[PDB]
Amino acid sequence: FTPVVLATPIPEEVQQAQTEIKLFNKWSFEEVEVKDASLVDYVQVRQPIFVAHTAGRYANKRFRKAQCPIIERLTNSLMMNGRNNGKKLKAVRIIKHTLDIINVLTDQNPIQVVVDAITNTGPREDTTRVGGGGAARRQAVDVSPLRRVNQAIALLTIGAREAAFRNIKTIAETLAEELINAAKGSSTSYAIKKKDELERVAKSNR
């Protein structure tokens, strides 16, 4: 990679990787393609990022929220349950740990495994409460792509934050677990069960 040194030294794998490939903590944004139709444009992956933290303005407009890098969309939704409100440094490290955990098992750039668990828990259709006179039936509705990524993000983190509650396993161990089961969905994960149950109730009224 044609190394270099000026006065204050820059470490070797730091010197190396960045200049060549612009990659994660260390992980590949190349390859890692969204495994389901749609869900692209609504999952980021390129532009690549070093670590998930940003000053990003994703609020000011309706759909620029989707343009947020997807991993930071996963970290952002970690830090909450108001004791943890704020504390993105807390979450970012849990994610780096989490990714390292998933990486350990079954190879697979874990950023891609994260891409897989999001695609696999998004409900294709759901139900809402129609008035229709008081006692309210359920008009099944297909749900938007943005709400399929959003709900997956919320469903995954919540199920791990709720499971990791009151036990030795760390958040990053359950976060990774919950993702590992949902990357190819095994229906052992909190998230998958709720996805399949919503899609069951939507099928059961129509």
Partner 1 sequence: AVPSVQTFGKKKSATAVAHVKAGKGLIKVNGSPITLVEPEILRFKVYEPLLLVGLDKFSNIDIRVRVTGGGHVSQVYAIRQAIAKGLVAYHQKYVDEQSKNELKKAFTSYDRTLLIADSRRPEPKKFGGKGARSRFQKSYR
Partner 2 sequence: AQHAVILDQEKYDRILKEVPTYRYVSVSVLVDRLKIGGSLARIALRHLEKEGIIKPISKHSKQAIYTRAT
Partner 3 sequence: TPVTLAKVIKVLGRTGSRGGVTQVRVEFLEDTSRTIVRNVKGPVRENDILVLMESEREARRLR
Question: Which of 6-14, 67-75, 101-109, 139-147 is the region at the interface with partner 3 (rule: CB under 8 A)?
Answer: 139-147
Contact 155, 74 (CB under 8 A): no
DSSP notation for the chain: ------SS---HHHHHHHHH---SSS--SSS---SSSS-SSSS--SS--SSS-----TTSSSSGGGGS-HHHHHHHTTS-SGGGSS-HHHHHHHHHHHHHHHHHTT-S-HHHHHHHHHHHHS-SEEEEE--SSSS--EEEEEPPHHHHHHHHHHHHHHHHHHHSTTSSS-HHHHHHHHHHHHHTT-S-SHHHHHHHHHHHHHHH--
CB of 184 to RNA, least distance (A): 23
Question: Which of 34-42, 118-126, 168-176, 179-187 is the region at the interface with RNA (rule: CB under 7 A)?
Answer: 168-176
**Single residue of 33, 50, 106, 137 touching partner 1 by CB under 8 A:** 50
Q: Does 117 bind partner 1 (CB under 8 A)?
A: no
Tallying the residues shown for the chain, one arrives at 206
| Contact string 130-169 vs partner 1 (x = CB under 8 A) | ----------------------------------------
CA-based nearest residue to 120, from 29, 31, 36, 202: 36
Residue 12 or 107: which CB sits closer to partner 2? 107
Residue 46 or 184: which CB sits closer to RNA? 46
Q: Does 129 bind RNA (CB under 7 A)?
A: no
Q: Does 178 bind partner 2 (CB under 8 A)?
A: no
Residue 7 or 168: which CB sits closer to partner 2? 168
Residues facing residue 141 across a β-bridge: 126
Q: How far apart are CA 44 and CA 73, in angstroms?
A: 10
Question: Which of 15-23, 72-80, 106-114, 196-204 is the region at the interface with RNA (rule: CB under 7 A)?
Answer: 72-80
Residues in region 142-201 near partner 3 by CB under 8 A: 142-148, 150-151, 199
Residues that bind partner 1 (CB under 8 A): 4, 6-11, 14-15, 18-19, 22, 47, 50-51, 53-57, 89, 92-93, 96
Residues that bind partner 2 (CB under 8 A): 93-94, 97, 100-101, 104-105, 168-170, 172-173
